[PDB]
Amino acid sequence: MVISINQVRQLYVAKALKANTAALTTAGDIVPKADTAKTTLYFQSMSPAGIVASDKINLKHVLYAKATPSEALAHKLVRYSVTLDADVSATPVAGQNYILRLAFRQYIGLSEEDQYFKYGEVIARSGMTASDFYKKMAISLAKNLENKTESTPLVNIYLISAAAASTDVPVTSATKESDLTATDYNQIIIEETEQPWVLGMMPQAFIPFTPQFLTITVDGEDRLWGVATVVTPTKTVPDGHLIADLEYFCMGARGDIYRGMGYPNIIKTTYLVDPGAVYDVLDIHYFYTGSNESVQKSEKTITLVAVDDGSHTAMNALIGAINTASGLTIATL
Amino acid sequence: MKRVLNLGNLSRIVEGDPNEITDDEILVIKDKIIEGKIIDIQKRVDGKLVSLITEKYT
């Protein structure tokens, strides 16, 4: 997860807020320090290897300072709703191959020229009601998607009974028609997947898809048999991994930039972000100017991250202390 | 036993929209619920699209 920096970006984790530097005992403790006036701002950050302190911010040269509510970083899993097109026919027509084409973008590569396609097949029979078609279609999708010898997990198939309308029922390549017993299956849902993630190696990413349909011959003409709707999602990624990869990257601006390259001959760096939690982020921008001829600026970003208990309590405590010690008015969350 | 119509009049047995069926062509309406069965054979007479199968009751 390499990012772009305005001449630098630094990160410090706030696992606990203290009043003085004589109280920085644990390896996440932080405290904002500033003059009795308002001339410089810096933070005393307790590292796993002793106290440290951020760069010194000239408060005449603070450009912007703003926090985030920890929900602007969650990625909602793109959810779809497949259905028979009533216009063509509200039921399958016997003797027709109701194929479905799952077009995938951002497959192994990172561009969209990198595409991948996965199909489903359902040959309709006489008396094949709609629920049975969705059942057999979902199963064909699962089977063709998750063959035990298929590396990447691409999508999660689901089904919804018109009775519930909310509780989506899963469909795996291990699922059997015997397990799907209802008869009022209204539609087929398809959803994204949290691809595998590795700290510093494999960034948080997703494979976008769109269900594309194939033509069938209804009374006399070739027509698409379904409808691919983009319904509102219900599942998110909790932002834990973005911050972890952010710290991993932003602690090389403050230390070992090799992070394992010459393996036996490396430095071991500790990280205080728990990937599995959810964080609210504070970010400060500023710059440094020199004297007579050295007027050029050097803009900088000092970044903080706290833990979101759902009420933005810790980040609010930070902002309170920073504004009390700096005269700033960073808006609370 | 012999063929029912010259292939010229059989090549005009089509499968489509009832609104686009003129004369010099016969229409077949395939059945959906049933695979091979047919619903009706139709032939236009005076703008109306009438059936050639005689209605049969109990």
Curated annotation (Swiss-Prot), chain A:
<keyword id="KW-0167">Capsid protein</keyword>
<protein>
    <recommendedName>
        <fullName>Auxiliary capsid protein</fullName>
    </recommendedName>
</protein>
<keyword id="KW-1232">Capsid decoration protein</keyword>
<dbReference type="GO" id="GO:0098021">
    <property type="term" value="C:viral capsid, decoration"/>
</dbReference>
<keyword id="KW-0946">Virion</keyword>
<feature type="region of interest" description="FD">
    <location>
        <begin position="75"/>
        <end position="237"/>
    </location>
</feature>
<comment type="subunit">
    <text>Interacts (via FD region) with the major capsid protein.</text>
</comment>
<comment type="function">
    <text>Auxiliary capsid protein that forms an outer layer on the major capsid protein protrusions.</text>
</comment>
From Swiss-Prot, chain B:
<comment type="function">
    <text>Forms short fibers at the surface of the viral capsid.</text>
</comment>
<protein>
    <recommendedName>
        <fullName>Head fiber dimeric protein</fullName>
    </recommendedName>
</protein>
<comment type="subunit">
    <text>Homodimer. Interacts with the major capsid protein.</text>
</comment>
